[PDB]
Amino acid sequence: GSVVIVGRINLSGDTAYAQQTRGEEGCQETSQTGRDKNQVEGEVQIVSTATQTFLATSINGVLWTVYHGAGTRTIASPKGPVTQMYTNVDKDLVGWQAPQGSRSLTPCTCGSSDLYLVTRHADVIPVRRRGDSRGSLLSPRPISYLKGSSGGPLLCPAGHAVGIFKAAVSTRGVAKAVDFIPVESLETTM
Ligand SMILES: C=C[C@@H]1C[C@]1(NC(=O)[C@@H]1C[C@@H]2CN1C(=O)[C@H](C(C)(C)C)NC(=O)O[C@@H]1C[C@H]1CCCCCc1nc3ccc(OC)cc3nc1O2)C(=O)NS(=O)(=O)C1CC1
Ligand SMILES: [Zn+2]
């Protein structure tokens, strides 16, 4: 089946909050036809397959998500199923053409290390960048807490995308740092 947009994380105001936009059955029909009529809004999409839900982030005109969530799937669209433009397993990276109506996050140009991770729950966690592709969490959470939030953006203090969340570095089933796909890697791909 196709990957279907089931919602969006809202950043366009003070609060971050997920608006779910489609039902399970609606998701199933639209996964199956690959034709999606629903309007697209914002930067961070909530996407799901038949069995998993995760996030998808628009950066430089391309909707980015994790390969471990989307596999090789097409995305359901107004004109039908769309094959991936970008698919890189080593990087765990896949991209489609950003859907009509979506907005891109501007890439971070500030070199700021006080980062922020937007989860599926629309919580905004401070992350402290610790490397070329790693940020430690100020407050550590259980791995369950972050699960389902891959493909989501890591933001600088100016609201710009720094990377895409990919994997959680876990000790005793507690995430203490997050592994991301820095924008610079997306541009290498593009
Ligand atoms: C808990 C939040 C976390 C963000 C989430 N990511 C994962 O769970 C990833 C997927 C998988 C394991 N992940 C992990 O995070 C593990 C885990 C033990 C699960 C905590 N952590 C981990 O390895 O830490 C090690 C230091 C890093 C080493 C680097 C890891 C490599 C990353 C990775 N790459 C590829 C490339 C290609 C593949 O093809 C099939 C598959 C891959 N799988 C991968 O890891 C998430 O929420 N997902 S999700 O939304 O529920 C799902 C629907 C989409
Ligand atoms: Zn910045």
Residue numbers in the entry: 990 to 1179
List sentences from the manuscript.
Unlike in the danoprevir and vaniprevir complexes with wild type, in the MK-5172-wild-type complex the P2 quinoxaline moiety did not stack on R155 and interacted less with D168 and the electrostatic network involving these residues. Thus, the single-site mutations R155K and D168A only caused very subtle changes in the MK-5172 binding conformations. This subtle effect is reflected in the small loss of potency against the R155K variant; however, MK-5172 exhibited 100-fold lower potency against the D168A variant, likely due to less extensive interactions with D81 and K136 relative to wild-type and R155K. Overall, analysis of the four crystal structures explains MK-5172's significantly retained potency against R155K and D168A as well as its loss of potency against the A156T variant due to the rigidity of the macrocycle. Unlike other inhibitors, MK5172 does not directly interact with R155 and D168, which mutate to confer multi-drug resistance.
The HCV NS3/4A protease – a chymotrypsin-like serine protease – is a prime therapeutic target that cleaves four known sites along the virally encoded polyprotein. The NS3/4A protease also hydrolyzes two human proteins, TRIF and MAVS, which are part of the innate immune system, thereby confounding the innate immune response to viral infection. To elucidate the underlying mechanism by which chemically diverse inhibitors bind to the wild-type protease and drug-resistant variants, crystal structures were determined for 16 inhibitor-protease complexes. These complexes include wild-type protease and resistant variants R155K, D168A and A156T each bound to telaprevir, danoprevir, vaniprevir and MK-5172, with resolutions ranging from 1.10–2.50 Å; S139A protease variants were used except for telaprevir, which requires covalent bond formation with the serine 139 for efficient binding.
